[PDB]
Amino acid sequence: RVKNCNLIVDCQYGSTGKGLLAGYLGALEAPQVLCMAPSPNAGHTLVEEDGTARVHKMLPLGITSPSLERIYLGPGSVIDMDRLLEEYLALPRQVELWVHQNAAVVLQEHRDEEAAGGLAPGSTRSGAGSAFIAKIRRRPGTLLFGEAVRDHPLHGVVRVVDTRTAQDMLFRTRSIQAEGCQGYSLSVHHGAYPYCTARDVTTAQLIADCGLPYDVARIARVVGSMRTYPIRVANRPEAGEWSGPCYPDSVECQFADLGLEQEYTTVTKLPRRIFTFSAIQAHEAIAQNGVDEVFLNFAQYPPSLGALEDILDAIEARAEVTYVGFGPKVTDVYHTPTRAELEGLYARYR
Amino acid sequence: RVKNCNLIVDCQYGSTGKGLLAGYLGALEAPQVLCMAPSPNAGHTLVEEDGTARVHKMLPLGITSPSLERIYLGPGSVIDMDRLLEEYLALPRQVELWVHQNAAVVLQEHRDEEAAGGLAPGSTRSGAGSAFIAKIRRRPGTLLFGEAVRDHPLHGVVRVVDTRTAQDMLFRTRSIQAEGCQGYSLSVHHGAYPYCTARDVTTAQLIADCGLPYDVARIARVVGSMRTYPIRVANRPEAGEWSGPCYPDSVECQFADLGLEQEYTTVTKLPRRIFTFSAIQAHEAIAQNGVDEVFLNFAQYPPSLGALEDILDAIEARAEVTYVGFGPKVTDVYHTPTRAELEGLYARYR
Ligand SMILES: Nc1ncnc2c1ncn2[C@H]1C[C@H](O)[C@@H](COP(=O)(O)OP(=O)(O)OP(=O)(O)O)O1
Ligand SMILES: Nc1ncnc2c1ncn2[C@H]1C[C@H](O)[C@@H](COP(=O)(O)OP(=O)(O)OP(=O)(O)O)O1
Ligand SMILES: Nc1nc2c(ncn2[C@H]2C[C@H](O)[C@@H](COP(=O)(O)O)O2)c(=O)[nH]1
Ligand SMILES: Nc1nc2c(ncn2[C@H]2C[C@H](O)[C@@H](COP(=O)(O)O)O2)c(=O)[nH]1
């Protein structure tokens, strides 16, 4: 019964625009089921045609799919139940929300622990690491989602499921979209430790955390997202935290070098760090993840068309650049543009 | 260049005989590279024709391969450097040992922490959970393998590698064998929490922790190992620990019910727990892992040939039983026996 499965994986340090990619593919491929293993580290963003933004930390953004029936948050999820309930109630259309019983739960004590600092440099301090560690530690009395939610208003809108139930549902689903979060180079396996997150960030880890059965993974297509200028989170110098290195064929630059205003963080108001494109990073992530199609986003950032074409050429040595993003809306993503069309798009978006 | 990749995954609670399976497939398929992401929870066993046992906690057991060139311990490894050095020096033939720089390391403090009890019921108390959590927590000063080994005699016999180096090596390898450890139903995602280990135990997690590139995983064959009678570790009643449930279509039994002597644990001398076969568990693990070939081991345990054939019939509803084990040696494993041949083997091994 399964005919299509798209896996969306971030090939840099996050913030490549996976909320946009998810919305775009949701409309293009019309999946019936969205899978995700969210953690509350950052909010992914879908900007509507009218300029309104929907920001999701706990739910996928393929909700543009006209065929959407169900969202399944897998056992590798790390769930803020308050935030999940809030995002669910705000959804535009009614859909079933299934959550695996063994997902971790984020409690205030986990946020409190990370708020004291002294852990990963540049940590979002979302509590995600502490919450996940509590699941992994298996101390008596630790409750995973299946038990923790019974105490919480969220229980009235979720179906708690085990893997037998999830398997049956997924094998009966025609088109599946699974949305990764974070970034390949934040992988605790493949990143520059300790400038990284608490888990691996690969196609394989996404399959594991979403609980996708391996025969479905075998037919899946992998869409890798990357920016023209990779970005890391801000430093926290008062806490003595530098948020980490770039690849050796990247150099750190300033937003002003692109004629852009500095990008600050949502709450703390700290300047994000930007770097030039790394072909080594792109090729390494493409190979690790088995990327079949690349989404190259922020194609309007390079200061010349030649600079954009050099990035395209680097990627295309290893994978097709199937989707090109010139802005934050679904209507700003273009499917396999010719080089001639690319010229017109670049000029128009600058 | 990659032509063959076999992934060995345990479909029950461990102790299905993956050391035997690895030795058998190593000789059958002659891989050039063995991949593993070991943790020190238990020792896997290869019994030689003469009755000698080799017990590995840190190294694969496909070392029967006449074409073996290299062992690669992936970034998801959790490494006791003393034990790894000891096992490496005892290997029969010279091979290259590569270890990913981001593997976790087990220190005495991790063993000490788990030795105090009060964590997962039935824990092996190997320190594996604490050591892995230290990697995940990213506290300043925590050293992963790449830095921790420089202080240790092991550094003289290992090549520390990153993912770019591992990728290049793996893509140039004709035949790869990756050996899972632990058991599907010990998965922190798919198991009965907290009667489980610290990570997922699936094909997907194995790919992630071994650092196998996804395009290699795509061509891989999955060999799932299972026993006629699933087994859990012993209870620890003095510590108030029960080691956990079986599936609902299994019932706990006694070794005496099979005419066998009680199986005790290597050090603590505690009785292992045995249960009848669960078809639900088998089918669930086959589906989650995408198992293509099943190794059914301990085929000499069922008290009648009909009881063995019922187990075979249950498995074969979903996957071929390709290998059948009637004893602990490579010469006790039989490839796709006919039912008539099975009759003679069962009679002879009883
Ligand atoms: N091509 C684009 N041009 C300008 N802004 C864009 C473009 N694509 C996306 N954006 C905006 C939307 C968000 O405000 C921001 C980051 O996108 P977002 O979807 O939140 O990233 P993400 O989900 O990949 O990673 P993160 O984990 O950092 O949230 O960039
Ligand atoms: N068919 C068999 N009959 C009898 N003994 C066997 C058979 N196959 C293997 N053994 C023995 C070898 C070991 O002493 C024991 C468990 O095997 P072993 O390779 O250590 O398990 P394993 O690696 O799958 O799991 P564990 O994590 O418990 O070590 O069973
Ligand atoms: N852009 C982005 N960065 C993340 C995300 N999760 C973690 N990071 C980065 C921020 C830090 O550089 C590093 C560690 O953060 P944390 O996992 O929150 O402790 O990983 C995410 O979802 N998006
Ligand atoms: N047979 C076996 N059991 C294991 C292994 N690792 C963990 N377990 C089981 C023992 C307990 O029931 C449970 C938790 O143990 P631990 O991960 O050591 O805290 O998982 C392994 O490698 N082999």
Author numbering:
A (entry chain A), B (entry chain A): 9 to 358
What does the original paper state about this entry?
It was recently demonstrated that a homologue of adenylosuccinate synthetase (PurZ) and a dATP triphosphohydrolase (DatZ) are two important pieces of the metabolism of 2-aminoadenine, participating in the synthesis of ZTGC-DNA. The post-infection composition of cellular dNTP pool is heavily altered: dATP is eliminated and replaced by dZTP, which is created in turn from dGTP.
Here, we determine that S-2L PurZ can use either dATP or ATP as a source of energy, thereby also depleting the pool of nucleotides in dATP. We crystallized S-2L PurZ with two of its substrates, dGMP and dATP, and solved its structure at 1.7 Å resolution. Through crystallographic symmetry, a PurZ dimer can be reconstructed for both S-2L and φVC8. Residues G22, S23, N49, A50, T132, Q190, V241 and the backbone atoms of Y21 form a pocket where the base moiety of dGMP is placed. Notably, R146 from the dimer’s other molecule forms an ion pair with the α-phosphate. Like ATP in φVC8 PurZ, the base moiety of dATP is stabilized by stacking interactions with F306 and P336 residues. Oxygen atoms from the side chains of N305, Q308 and the backbone of G335 form hydrogen bonds with adenine’s 6-amino group. The corresponding residues in PurZ extend noticeably further, being 7.9 Å (S-2L R244) and 8.5 Å (φVC8 K267) away from C2′, precluding any possible stabilization of the ribonucleotide.
